[PDB]
């Protein structure tokens, strides 16, 4: 068990702190000409969607308490790296300039089974012609994560889609309703290409809202799993969805356990996991942790005749797909495919 993640962002100066696993030492990231990318990369590693802003700090005046020495970034390996721990070497930072960055505030309840308002501020309702069809989880104000299966050819007219947020009850007039610009679905979700296909695999879609949702105590984004963060067998997470929003505390079940118990002898496919039987389609599967020195809820699964373990899209396996689809398809209108 790793109770503390090897990448940290400071609560006082917002400085980035990276752990040297072999030396057991915390180090500061050395400042370079590609500070924007590293700030962004460091926030992504910790499960944040992006860096809001980054800053340049100096040891001479900024202190260096809690760290010893520095890590330098490989600026040549950085453009196509999926990890920060692979592109960093132990170095001496002569100028003593280190990286500080403010990440997007993510996965927290802003407190000042029927549910009460504010417990899951990321939970959204996706409505087609007024009717609730699929669930979603806000990753930001104008980005929702859900299932690909939510958009069959039948429900592809985007101007007929709406995203309901900041309300537990579907009839609540307090909750906000916004339209949809693009729907980025995984090109690897085969039941779309084949209507006789067995698969639940690559059942992930990114809903981009035409305008950002105001972030309130009722509306907030959820965290993505951290880079390398494990899905613990026996860890009890929460699944939410629907006309008042309900929650269920469900345990994570081993691949082996579900595969050894399945009645039809069906094996859980790659990029997917199972969880105990207590389930709204595309709805969230969130777990809480303190690996970032603060309790944060993270989106671990997507809901993809039986009282059997539910099968979910394992979100940690689509981290890059999510970070790429947003970088690439921000300016897109309509249905979009992302391989």
């Amino acid at each position, epitope marked *: 068990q790793e109770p503390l993640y090897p990448v940290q962002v400071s609560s006082a100066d917002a400085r980035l702190m990276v752990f040297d696993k072999t030396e057991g030492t915390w180090r500061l990231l050395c400042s370079s000409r590609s500070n924007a990318r590293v700030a962004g990369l460091s926030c992504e590693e910790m499960g944040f969607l992006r860096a809001l802003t980054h800053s340049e700090l100096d040891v001479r005046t900024a202190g260096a308490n809690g760290t010893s020495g520095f890590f330098c970034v490989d600026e040549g390996r950085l453009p196509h790296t999926q990890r920060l721990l692979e592109v960093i070497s132990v170095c001496d930072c002569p100028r003593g300039r280190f990286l500080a960055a403010i990440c997007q505030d993510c996965g927290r309840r802003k407190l000042p089974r029927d549910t009460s308002l504010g417990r899951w501020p990321w939970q959204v309702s996706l409505r087609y012609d007024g009717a609730h069809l699929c669930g979603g989880s806000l990753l930001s104000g104008d980005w929702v994560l859900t299932a690909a299966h939510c958009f069959p050819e039948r429900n592809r007219v985007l101007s007929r889609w709406r995203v309901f947020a900041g309300a537990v009850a579907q009839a609540s007039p307090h909750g906000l309703q916004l339209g949809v610009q693009a729907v980025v679905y995984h090109g690897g979700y085969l039941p779309f290409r084949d209507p006789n296909s067995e698969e639940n695999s690559n059942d992930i879609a990114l809903v981009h809202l035409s305008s950002p949702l105001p972030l309130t105590e009722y509306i907030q984004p959820v965290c993505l799993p951290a880079a390398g963060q494990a899905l613990v067998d026996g860890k009890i997470c929460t699944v939410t969805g629907w006309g008042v929003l309900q929650e269920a505390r469900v345990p994570i079940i081993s691949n082996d356990v579900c595969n050894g118990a399945d009645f*039809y002898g069906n094996q859980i496919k790659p990029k997917m996991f199972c969880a105990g039987y207590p389930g709204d389609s595309g709805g969230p599967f969130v777990c809480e942790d303190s690996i970032s020195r603060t309790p944060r809820w993270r989106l671990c699964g997507i809901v993809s005749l039986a009282q059997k373990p539910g099968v979910y899209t394992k979100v940690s396996d689509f981290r890059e797909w999510i970070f790429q689809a947003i970088k690439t398809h921000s300016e897109a209108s309509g249905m979009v495919t992302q391989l």
Partner: antibody, heavy 113, light 110 residues
Framework: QVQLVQSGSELKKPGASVKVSCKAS????????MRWVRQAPGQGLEWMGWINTETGSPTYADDFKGRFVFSLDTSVSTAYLQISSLKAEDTAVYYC??????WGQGTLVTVSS | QTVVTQEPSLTVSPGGTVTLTCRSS?????????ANWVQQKPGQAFRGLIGDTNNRAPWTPARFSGSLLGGKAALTLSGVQPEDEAEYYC?????????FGSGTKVTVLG
């Protein structure tokens, strides 16, 4: 047409070995696992474990560790079971199953001196 | 030492309804035991009827219901046919393995 067909009855002496077969058809063999169940004469049923077919990795029930070995041959889509150093108590009808939904007819293994 | 207990033999008349219980010796049968029911008709191969407490197999009809009845796993056979006569085995999952109940012979009374 999901079908499971097992090899014929075996008559072995104590100390010998036996490779019992289970041919699968009517589905993509790699998408679904295979499990082994034993029934000794007039006795109950025993889940012996299962074999992962996309990795080929076997899981064995406590009682079956050591002598028994689940193995595969994908090209011909068949699941195997080999019991080395056969003992008097290995006398049983051994079945293959893809979940509990689909079973083989069973293979009788008589171990006698 | 875990034993799964089934009624040795049960009678039912054509058209009648019968319920078969499955007991766990460690206590209450729960959804975590993902109770399966297997049928063996005379001379025929085994055929899974029910899995994960109440999931019906493609060949098992609607008159066949699997549930949890008073800390046990139960299998109901409604509007019984003389063809329903077989041996019924329940399998309970215990963390990492299955345990089969000794079995029940349901005789359709002819």
């Amino acid at each position: 047409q999901v079908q499971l067909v097992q090899s014929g009855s075996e008559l072995k002496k104590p100390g010998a070995s036996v490779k019992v077969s289970c041919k699968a058809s009517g589905y993509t063999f790699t998408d679904y696992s295979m499990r082994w169940v034993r029934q000794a004469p007039g006795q109950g049923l025993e889940w012996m474990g299962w074999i992962n077919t996309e990795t080929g990795s076997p899981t064995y029930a406590d009682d079956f560790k050591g002598r028994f070995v689940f193995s595969l041959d994908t090209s011909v889509s068949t699941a195997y079971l080999q019991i080395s150093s056969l003992k008097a108590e290995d006398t049983a009808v051994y079945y293959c199953a893809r979940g509990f939904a689909y079973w083989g007819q069973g293979t009788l293994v008589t171990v006698s001196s | 030492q875990t034993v799964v207990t089934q009624e040795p033999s049960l009678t039912v008349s054509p058209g009648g309804t019968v319920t078969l219980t499955c007991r766990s010796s460690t206590g209450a049968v729960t959804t975590s035991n993902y109770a399966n029911w297997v049928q063996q008709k005379p001379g025929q191969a085994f055929r899974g009827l029910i899995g994960d407490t109440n999931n019906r197999a493609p060949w098992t009809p609607a008159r066949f219901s699997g549930s949890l009845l008073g800390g046990k796993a139960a299998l109901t056979l409604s509007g019984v046919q003389p063809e329903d006569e077989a041996e019924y085995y329940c399998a309970l999952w215990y963390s990492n393995h299955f345990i089969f109940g000794s079995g029940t012979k349901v005789t359709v009374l002819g």
